[PDB]
RNA sequence: AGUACUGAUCGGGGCCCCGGUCAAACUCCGAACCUGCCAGCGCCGUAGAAGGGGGGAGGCGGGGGCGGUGGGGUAAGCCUCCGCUCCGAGACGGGAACAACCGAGACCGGGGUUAAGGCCCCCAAGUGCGGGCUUAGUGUCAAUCUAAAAGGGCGUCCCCCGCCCAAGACAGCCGAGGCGGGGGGCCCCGAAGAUGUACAGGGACUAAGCCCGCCGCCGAGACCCCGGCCCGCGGGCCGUUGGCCCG
RNA sequence: CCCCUGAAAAGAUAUCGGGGGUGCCCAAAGCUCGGCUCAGGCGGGUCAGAAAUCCGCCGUAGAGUGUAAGGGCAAAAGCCGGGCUGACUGGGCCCUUGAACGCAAGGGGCCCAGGCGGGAAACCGGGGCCUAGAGAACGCUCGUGCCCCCACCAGUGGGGGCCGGGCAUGACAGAAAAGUUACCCUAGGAAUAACCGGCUCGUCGCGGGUGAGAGUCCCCAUCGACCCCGCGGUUUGGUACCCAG
RNA sequence: GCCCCUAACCCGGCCAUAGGCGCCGGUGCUACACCCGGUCUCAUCAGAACCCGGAAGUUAAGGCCGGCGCCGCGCUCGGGAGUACUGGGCUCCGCGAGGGCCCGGGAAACCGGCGUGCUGGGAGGGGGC
């Protein structure tokens, strides 16, 4: 900036995307990283191997892939996070990845957060990810029961607020109170699609 | 492929008080006594050595006729025996002139055969077998100008060009 | 007064960095995987001095003998004596020259 | 003070880091620029004379001061302070040392001879190179003879041979 | 090199900008150079490289030249480091003498040719060749080694610049060059000591001095050659605690 | 012992060389996780002020990091808060002390096993961000083990042993130690002083350049501030080359 | 699945040609955002932040792209300059500290000119197998 003695930080640091102190500790593992990132509308899950010239992404997907299995819930809620991990987990397993280490970047590791839901989905597909037993969200939250309970209360309190806060839910034809039923349907379709693929 | 020019190098200064790095290089160039002379192929690695010993030797491009005379008068084989026309003919070289021209022109890349060279049958060797790889010269008739000054400012050391042949004829 | 011999005793110049190298170094040196027989160059990183080898090994070429956890066991020479340097990759660079 | 020949030659490294030198002497030159120093009035002057060193060596602070006094006094008298600019161009950064037995200068100074020989500060000098400008004058061409005389007087106070170079600005 | 970090420091202009002076314990830059690995060259090596074992030491006071302004010191044939070489432990030629400066490395005898250096006599080889300078015997072919500074001199030889003179310049009508500045070479003054002469080898020399060049010659134990001797290593023969022959 | 310089861009490097420091301190100033950003400046804000707490902007580190100096450090190596004791038990290998090249103690690094702390995890923790704060043999003492031994056998008391911690040598690779000799003695030393000599010349003595100023006027009849160049070996010193039968 | 091409997004390498200041434009189906709320997981003085649930509004800001100017920075470009410095040799100069010649290397400041991120993997989109 001002003068020759000014040291400009790393590009990814001044963009505010990479914590290089935490990234160094991840690379010391020499294991593939499960990279999970949150956007306003979608979630991103990637399985990455680090190489000296740049990282290599074995499998990468965002939550747009859920439309390929007829998902009608929101794009990036707890239920969508779990389904994304399942798809990534099976795809990663098909490529030979057995174990991964969770990499959440700048997000906070709050218990029950969506990053640990993606981890839970990845674990259930056979990819082992070390973790503590008090951060995975409860199965009710993964099934969307917290979404359905909220909408049911909204409808009987302010029926109009139900219409606005879930307008896109009504457009897709899936009312929020029926999310747990649909989540099982989508989860079954994903699991069956890949166990058969693995079998063949 | 590339044929480097062939140079004659003469040691002009003596052994005692010679600096250590210069003395080591002279030994590797086979100039281990004063007024000893060698012919080398001027590859870049060799020219780096001559630059190191520039203040102790004089050198220049040797001509085939001068080399022919040097071989006939100061060429020695194993046992410190004279090099004779008959010995050359036994090995397939017709004359002193032909082998000298073969070396100067680049047809052969070495004048004296190496230590581990093995002579075949019928095949003319690409060198002179058992020739000693150095020549012991006479002091120059009529003297030098100065063994302490460079040839470029009126002395005798360093690069001399084709005038090395005039000096060699006086030292034969 | 005689020379003092602390582990880092004449290392002001060696351990100094120019302004443009201030701060953390890049992580690519962490990601090279060395196998036995590889040639490495010991290039001390001053931001990790506690794991760095002695100043006498800066710029020397060694051969990787094996691994010890996360460090590499490197066989090198100081003059004529064989030395074993065990160090982490942040103080190593691949030797491309053979 | 010793004869200046004792400190004329450059025999070692410069000794100038006053934060490591105990009792480094203060500079005893009050001014370095004399005459008319303002840049606007110097535009009237169109000639430049320089007293240039001919050898490398060390000029003591008192010799620079003696040279500055004689030349500046001469120019003030004969040329006039409004008609010239004179600058002493070198600064005596180097500290001189002397190994003498003394009291009130440290216990090691009480050991005689070459034991603990590192000297205590004795003065200051400027280390100069050949061709270096010692004195610099700006003047009007009508006063050339007077400026040359002033620099001839300055040179007689200095420990090294010098020469006068006159050029236009 | 820079003055940009840490400091020092002289000026100008409106805490900033510009110019300047500096740094062993300052550094954006940054050589020569040294050094690691690999490949090649060169040389050494199966008549035995690397590596290893065993016996016996001496020695554990060093010194000279040159280079790191090494660092210190007023300086020292001084103190204390780093590197090549030499003396110690190395003959011999030159340096007037002289461990370590130059040349050069010696088995013995002889012949030849050179090195440093020299070639008027002492003293082997030139009263050698061209040009110029010095008038002071200045000086008399590097160092050890016997010397000289600031400063003054158109003393003399020379180079450059500025101005005047277009023949009405400089000097006191005359008729052709003149005035000032800067620098270089040699020499003069500055330059004063103690047993005995222009000391630095002596005679002496006006070149037998100095500067720019050049030609030939002399001159070591070096280099070349011949003869003799010895040695290391390898090979062979002989009934061998050893002898002899060959390369 | 430690840092910077000397040190001559690999390594090593000395002087009664230069600038400093060390014989500690801290249950946190040690471990880890998270959050945050410092010195300083500006704008606004009740006492309130140069400086207290509050809102905002700028701020490459101009702060801090126990302690010398040098080095490192900005979503940290700094500041604050949460949880802790790894300043851990048993061992191995390497680096440095100690260059290439023999050789203590001390210090550092990388690991394996046991059992923990922090953390979602990665990972980190065998003191302090790195380079200093460091002690043989004999003796004593403590810890440890279903431990080993004590003279023909068994028992009781007692003693000894192997492994580890400590009690100390700072002249720090480790004796337990005051003077005086002019009454002095011996072995030697020019490895080393005193006289003379050698080298050097700061000092001493002598000469020169310069010309501020004095001299009624007038630098130079006579002087000569401030400075500078020298000579002598005549004072004193520096050095330690020769000479201690 | 596979290969090729390709914006903004995700993970990177080198870590200013990437930074800084100012001005002028482009981009919005999708993607990135700003944005709407605080029942639930989690969070604080504070739903600002973090975390969760969303999709009414908007390209005003961020991100990304293009242009201009200045500062800073970069360059195997011209000059500076074969200068400074330097390895080896010298009975070459100088009273001396020091300089010179020959063989071999060879800067820096500064002035001018040019430049002002490059690139690896993935998603998404397009084309074929
Ligand atoms: Mg010699
Ligand atoms: Mg030592
Ligand atoms: Mg530590
Ligand atoms: Mg000195
Ligand atoms: Mg300078
Ligand atoms: Mg070096
Ligand atoms: Mg000794
Ligand atoms: Mg010596
Ligand atoms: Mg002896
Ligand atoms: Mg003699
Ligand atoms: Mg004669
Ligand atoms: Mg003098
Ligand atoms: Mg005379
Ligand atoms: Mg070094
Ligand atoms: Mg400490
Ligand atoms: Mg932290
Ligand atoms: Mg020791
Ligand atoms: Mg050793
Ligand atoms: Mg210690
Ligand atoms: Mg018994
Ligand atoms: Mg001791
Ligand atoms: Mg006497
Ligand atoms: Mg005496
Ligand atoms: Mg006096
Ligand atoms: Mg006078
Ligand atoms: Mg005396
Ligand atoms: Mg003595
Ligand atoms: Mg004597």
Short mmCIF file of C-alpha atoms (C1' of nucleotides) and ligand atoms in Angstrom, two decimals, chain B residues 13 16-18 56, chain E residues 102-104, chain G residues 90, ligand 1:
data_model
loop_
_atom_site.label_atom_id
_atom_site.label_comp_id
_atom_site.label_asym_id
_atom_site.label_seq_id
_atom_site.Cartn_x
_atom_site.Cartn_y
_atom_site.Cartn_z
CA UNK B 13 58.10 -20.69 -14.56
CA UNK B 16 59.46 -23.58 -5.80
CA UNK B 17 57.20 -20.66 -4.55
CA UNK B 18 54.52 -21.37 -7.23
CA UNK B 56 52.92 -19.60 -15.33
"C1'" C E 102 63.87 -12.48 -7.43
"C1'" G E 103 65.41 -17.04 -10.20
"C1'" A E 104 65.45 -22.10 -8.96
"C1'" C G 90 54.21 -7.88 -11.95
MG1 LIG H 1 59.55 -17.38 -6.97
#
